[PDB]
């Protein structure tokens, strides 16, 4: 990592990030099996089989009920029917609105008749088979058959004539083992009305994630990247519920597609910088902070940091929440004297004190003379800085103090550079096009 301080505009950039961007969605359709658990009956006292058989059957009744609630909440997620504004906003529509809607529309196509018939018919002999849908889209279909393999053959024979209390206790404990995955699946869909927020170890176990990531049609680099980041692959995909068709549960999980795997990216963060006199006590501000990433010779701009993650060097952004910017916009970081690109800047007559945390360094602005001191761990107070826009590295300091509020600094080690230049002496209007 490399960070360069720009005293000309009191901003910094870190220019050593690789990146991955999500481009599309790879869908996967699962199908559990419970078998004919609804027919056999336990009717002799309380036993271990008694308390588990009733537990399993109760899950099936509940899961049929939540299907009548998903159908009601899908009308509110696809169009602003009665969303209203009011207050305490959940701020839906930021990124997910264009993602959940696409996923739901696939579910409607699947949950029709003669479609689940095809999915189930294609898996009659094997536990893995790729199949196409009505509208050309191809899906991967997986069948998991532990309970049906256990309830059918070596549970019914034990439970005869409704005599459901046997000296054999191995079966009683064993039934609890195979039942655990099913109970977790139904409970998750029940609490979220069918739309789980992220993949869990019960919708798609690890052995079923490697087989679902090495079967996609992709490059040989994308596969090797996604196998080393299972944590963030799991954390960026959601599942949907299709329904309860017979004695089985059918649901689909959306997996992300990383269309770009290696390309430089950088962060820009700015701080107010006046260096003005008491008269005309106003100055400039860079409102161009955020992320930058290259995909096809045209940078994508993310206005705020919350839209992208970080796992060391990699940056897990999304392509649906970025705005296309001409690649000449990198010139602003080089210099402001250049007039080739109209460089964004905003002014203001009320300069406030503010501190910006850099991923490697730190930025401080301190104008009204309040005690703004650098701090550390072994030494409480090191020195009192003058005015503001004094970039401080975490190698030299540990904390910064402003209005009796401390800020901690990260321990990441990397190269630091400072670029000498003349700050804006007085208020200028060569480039102040926006505001």
């Amino acid at each position, epitope marked *: 990592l490399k960070e360069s301080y720009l005293e000309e505009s009191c901003s910094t950039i870190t220019e050593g990030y690789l990146s991955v961007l999500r481009t*599309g969605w790879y869908t996967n359709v699962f199908t559990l099996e419970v078998g004919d658990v609804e027919n056999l009956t336990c009717a002799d006292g309380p036993s271990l089989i008694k308390t588990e058989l009733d537990l399993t059957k109760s899950a099936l009744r509940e899961l049929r009920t939540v299907s009548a609630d998903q159908l009601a909440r899908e009308e509110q997620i696809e169009n602003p029917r009665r969303r209203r504004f009011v207050l305490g906003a959940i701020a839906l529509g930021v990124c997910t609105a264009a993602a959940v809607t696409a996923g739901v529309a696939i579910a409607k196509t699947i949950r029709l008749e003669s479609e689940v018939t095809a999915i189930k018919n294609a898996l009659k002999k094997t536990n893995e088979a790729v199949s196409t849908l009505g509208n050309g889209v*191809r899906v991967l279909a997986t069948a998991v058959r532990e309970l049906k393999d256990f309830v059918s053959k070596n549970l019914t024979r034990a439970i005869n004539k409704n005599k459901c209390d046997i000296p054999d206790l191995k079966m009683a404990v064993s039934f609890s083992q195979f039942n655990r995955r099913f109970l977790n699946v139904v409970r998750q869909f029940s609490d979220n009305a069918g739309i789980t927020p992220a993949i869990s170890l019960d919708l798609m176990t690890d052995a079923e994630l490697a087989r679902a990531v090495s079967n996609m049609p*992709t490059s040989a*680099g994308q596969i090797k990247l996604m196998l080393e980041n299972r944590a963030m692959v799991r954390r960026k995909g959601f599942g949907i519920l299709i329904g309860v068709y017979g004695s089985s549960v059918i649901y689909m999980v959306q997996l992300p597609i990383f269309g770009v795997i*290696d390309t430089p990216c950088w962060i820009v963060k700015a701080a107010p910088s006046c260096s003005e006199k008491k008269g005309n006590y106003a100055c400039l501000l860079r409102e161009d902070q955020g992320w930058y990433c290259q995909n096809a010779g045209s940078t994508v701009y993310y206005p705020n940091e919350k839209d992208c993650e970080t796992r060391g060097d990699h940056v897990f952004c999304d392509t649906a929440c970025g705005i296309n910017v001409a690649e000449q916009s990198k010139e602003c970081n080089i210099n402001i004297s250049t007039t080739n690109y109209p460089c964004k800047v905003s002014t203001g007559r009320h300069p406030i004190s503010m501190v910006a945390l850099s991923p490697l360094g730190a930025l401080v602005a301190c104008y009204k003379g309040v005690s703004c001191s650098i701090g550390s761990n072994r030494v409480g107070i090191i020195k009192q800085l003058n005015k503001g826009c004094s970039y401080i590295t975490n190698q030299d300091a540990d904390t910064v103090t402003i209005d009796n509020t401390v800020y901690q600094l990260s321990k990441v080690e990397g190269e630091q550079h400072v670029i000498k230049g003349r700050p804006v002496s007085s208020s200028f209007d060569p480039v102040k096009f926006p505001e």
Partner: antibody
Framework: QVQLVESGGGVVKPGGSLRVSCVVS????????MHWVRQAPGKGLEWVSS????????NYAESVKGRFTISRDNAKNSLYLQMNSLRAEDTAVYYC???????????????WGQGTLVTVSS | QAVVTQPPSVSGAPGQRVIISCTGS?????????VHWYQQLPGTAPKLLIY???NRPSGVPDRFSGSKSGTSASLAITGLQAEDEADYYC??????????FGGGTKLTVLG
């Protein structure tokens, strides 16, 4: 306006080494994966190597694994292909081609270069 | 593991229609990959003809077309003429062999 130029071809005795080069111009070099494609004289095309845009993931053809070396330098806008233990059946014309993809299931080489020739004989 | 098979040569006459078939396998085209076509004139480097299994880049004279279905793809030329005399290749991707190229066919005009 995209333009690729190859250089470094020549004649080398078997069991030697050579460093082919390819210098690009007219597009942002540090955003595209680049390839090396060879063609024997009078034969069909064949893929040889590949490298991502930051020298992170490198793929080699099975026939030449462990003997070649692909490298990049984003500052000078060029990529190199160091060869070792050259054999008689390795003479061909070498191309450097940019990579194009739609994201999931399409991959092709749109801007093919001009080419350089390498002869291996005893 | 897998390889793409292409006929050695196909001969035709001016004014007719020519079909070139690119036969894949279970791991090349069966896994939903692409087929792309390159034309190599006898003296220069190849150029892109068909990408995305049906599309046409700018400069293609609106008479070349192709399609993919199952594990086989074909290339169609309507209104054959004299200067369409070159070698044609079909490309794809493979699970274990990475990028793969077809055998390469030579088109002959009988005029």
């Amino acid at each position: 306006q995209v333009q690729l130029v190859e250089s470094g071809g020549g004649v080398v005795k078997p069991g030697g080494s050579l460093r082919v080069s390819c210098v690009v111009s007219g597009f942002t070099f540090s955003s595209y994966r680049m390839h090396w494609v060879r063609q024997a004289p009078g034969k069909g095309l064949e893929w040889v190597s590949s490298i991502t845009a930051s020298s992170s993931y490198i793929n080699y053809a099975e026939s030449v694994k462990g003997r070649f070396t692909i490298s990049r330098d984003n500052a000078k806008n060029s990529l190199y292909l160091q060869m070792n233990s050259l054999r008689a059946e390795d003479t061909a014309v070498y191309y450097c081609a940019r990579d194009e993809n739609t994201g999931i299931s399409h991959y092709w080489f749109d801007p093919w270069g001009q080419g350089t020739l390498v002869t291996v004989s005893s | 593991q897998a390889v793409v098979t292409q006929p050695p040569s196909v001969s035709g006459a001016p004014g007719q229609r020519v079909i070139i078939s690119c036969t894949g396998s279970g791991s090349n085209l069966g896994a939903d990959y692409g087929v792309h076509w390159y034309q190599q004139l006898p003296g220069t480097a190849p150029k892109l003809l068909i990408y995305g299994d049906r599309n046409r880049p700018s400069g293609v004279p609106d008479r070349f077309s192709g399609s993919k279905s199952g594990t086989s793809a074909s290339l169609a030329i309507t209104g054959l003429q004299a200067e369409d005399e070159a070698d044609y290749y079909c490309q794809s991707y493979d699970r274990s062999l990475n990028w793969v190229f077809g055998g390469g066919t030579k088109l002959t005009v009988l005029g």
